Amino acid sequence: GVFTFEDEITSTVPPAKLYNAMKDADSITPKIIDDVKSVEIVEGNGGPGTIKKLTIVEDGETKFILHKVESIDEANYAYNYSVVGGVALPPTAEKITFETKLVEGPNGGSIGKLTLKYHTKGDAKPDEEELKKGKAKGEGLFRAIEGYVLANPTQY
Numbered sequence: 001g002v003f004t005f006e007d008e009i010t011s012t013v014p015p016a017k018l019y020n021a022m023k024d025a026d027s028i029t030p031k032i033i034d035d036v037k038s039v040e041i042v043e044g045n046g047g048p049g050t051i052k053k054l055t056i057v058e059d060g061e062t063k064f065i066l067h068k069v070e071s072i073d074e075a076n077y078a079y080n081y082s083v084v085g086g087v088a089l090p091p092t093a094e095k096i097t098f099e100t101k102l103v104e105g106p107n108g109g110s111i112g113k114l115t116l117k118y119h120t121k122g123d124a125k126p127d128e129e130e131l132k133k134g135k136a137k138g139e140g141l142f143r144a145i146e147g148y149v150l151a152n153p154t155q156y
């Protein structure tokens with residue numbers, strides 16, 4: 001089964017810029033996140049369908065996460081990707097998607113929804129903590145991306 005959660009948020013950065021930064025996740029993430037060290041394309045051209053491998057060190061031990069790029073709606077400032085392998089997936093959970101949608105803000109800010117789709121195996125329901133870890137993680141990347149942009153205004 002699949003279980004969906006939606007969270008709403010705002011940013012001072014206009015959505016067009018956040019979106020650009022969002023598309024450049026491979027580049028930025030290793031810089032902003034201490035534990036992320038690299039992102040490599042395994043197969044695909046960076047578009048939807050692409051499979052990526054993230055290398056991390058956590059508590060000094062190297063680990064791998066596997067991502068799939070789900071869709072892109074540039075006109076709509078939407079960037080979606082799923083965690084398809086690695087540390088975030090318990091056996092009941094087959095995948096976890098993170099979707100980010102941005103809309104025009106009142107103050108030349110961005111209005112955005114973070115959607116988490118938790119796909120479990122069979123009738124299993126999501127673990128409470130995994131869900132909590134996943135929400136924090138989604139929100140975390142968004143903030144990190146926002147931070148990079150504030151730090152560097154003209155890059156995007």
Ligand code: NA
Nearest residue numbers: 030033034036
């Ligand atoms: Na790093």
